[PDB]
Amino acid sequence: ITGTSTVGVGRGVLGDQKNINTTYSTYYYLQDNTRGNGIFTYDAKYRTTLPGSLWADADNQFFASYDAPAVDAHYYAGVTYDYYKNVHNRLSYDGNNAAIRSSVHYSQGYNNAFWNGSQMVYGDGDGQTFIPLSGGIDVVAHELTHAVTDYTAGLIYQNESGAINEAISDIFGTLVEFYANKNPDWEIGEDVYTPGISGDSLRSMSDPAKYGDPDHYSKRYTGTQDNGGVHINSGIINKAAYLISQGGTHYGVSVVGIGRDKLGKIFYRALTQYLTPTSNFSQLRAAAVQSATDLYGSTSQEVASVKQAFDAVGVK
Numbered sequence: 001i002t003g004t005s006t007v008g009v010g011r012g013v014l015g016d017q018k019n020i021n022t023t024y025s026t027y028y029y030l031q032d033n034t035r036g037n038g039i040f041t042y043d044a045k046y047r048t049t050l051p052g053s054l055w056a057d058a059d060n061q062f063f064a065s066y067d068a069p070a071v072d073a074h075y076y077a078g079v080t081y082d083y084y085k086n087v088h089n090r091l092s093y094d095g096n097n098a099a100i101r102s103s104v105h106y107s108q109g110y111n112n113a114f115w116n117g118s119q120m121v122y123g124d125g126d127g128q129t130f131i132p133l134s135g136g137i138d139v140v141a142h143e144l145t146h147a148v149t150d151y152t153a154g155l156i157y158q159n160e161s162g163a164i165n166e167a168i169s170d171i172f173g174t175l176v177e178f179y180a181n182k183n184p185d186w187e188i189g190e191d192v193y194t195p196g197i198s199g200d201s202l203r204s205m206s207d208p209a210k211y212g213d214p215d216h217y218s219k220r221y222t223g224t225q226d227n228g229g230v231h232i233n234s235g236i237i238n239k240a241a242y243l244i245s246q247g248g249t250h251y252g253v254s255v256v257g258i259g260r261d262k263l264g265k266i267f268y269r270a271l272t273q274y275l276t277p278t279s280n281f282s283q284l285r286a287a288a289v290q291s292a293t294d295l296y297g298s299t300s301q302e303v304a305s306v307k308q309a310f311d312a313v314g315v316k
């Protein structure tokens, strides 16, 4: 809407206070005019019609329990925008500052979040499996990264291309979590998953096998569940990414870590210059090797480490 830019304050899902960019016109709306063509957060009101209504608040204070998922969806969308702009010189998901839209309070007891082709969508969880999912910065960045992927490589959401699609979202979700530098790790969704259980997560990039997922190509899922295992086989690529950044010896293959910034550069370049809608794991290896070559030279440690990592997870 048309209005004047303002700054509200509230608390997120985990009880942390933060400032948020709002817009005033009669009400204070969750509309951040400071980033591209805007970040807009909507209330789905426990229903499934999207986007719902642009979030309106009478006093610019967002401390109600009902407010918390909106505060975090809005704020973390901002952090993710900042990451892509400051780190990769990318302006929003389309590269041209497209408006970023999110809806919260989607459905009832909804244990998921997604990009629906046009916007981000967050459930509140059932209070047992999840608390409201926008409380996870890695989750918010995972979802916005699906938009980035769709506007770039366009990886089809099934089988190997779909598992790459998933891993790209987990990789950048994690890199955004490190960028914000609040309790960062290589786990996915730990801040919002199972409030009754401490120390667990939905997936692990450092050890995918701890949450049921393969860490080597020989252990790839080949059935039809989960669009041919897109959230399962992502473990193979997540492990490779983890090894490229942090190093390690995996099934006897040692990888020299080159750090998160170079991981990010290599995979961003692969995503935006080399991957296609039908790329498979082998093609991802080639894309990453070429990206590392472009950036650091064919005889570089960076190129050697990318090769080592894909070797370690059995992807040739």
Ligand SMILES: CC(C)C[C@H](NC(=O)[C@H](CC(C)C)NP(=O)(O)CNC(=O)OCc1ccccc1)C(=O)O
Binding pocket: 111, 112, 113, 114, 115, 116, 117, 133, 138, 139, 142, 143, 146, 157, 188, 189, 202, 226, 231
């Ligand atoms: C138990 C759940 C959360 C695991 C898993 N979902 C996930 O890992 C993350 C959320 C997570 C980071 C918290 N959600 P996602 O974006 O990968 C769900 N994708 C999904 O919904 O894709 C289908 C779709 C395609 C086109 C339009 C609309 C929908 C899944 O869908 O299986």
Ligand SMILES: [Ca+2]
Binding pocket: 057, 058, 059, 060, 061, 062, 063
């Ligand atoms: Ca209020």
Ligand SMILES: [Ca+2]
Binding pocket: 177, 182, 183, 184, 185, 190, 191
């Ligand atoms: Ca964390």
Ligand SMILES: [Ca+2]
Binding pocket: 138, 174, 177, 184, 185, 186, 187, 188, 189, 190
């Ligand atoms: Ca995490």
Ligand SMILES: [Ca+2]
Binding pocket: 190, 192, 193, 194, 195, 196, 197, 198, 199, 200, 201
């Ligand atoms: Ca937990």
Ligand SMILES: [Zn+2]
Binding pocket: 142, 146, 166, 169
């Ligand atoms: Zn996903």
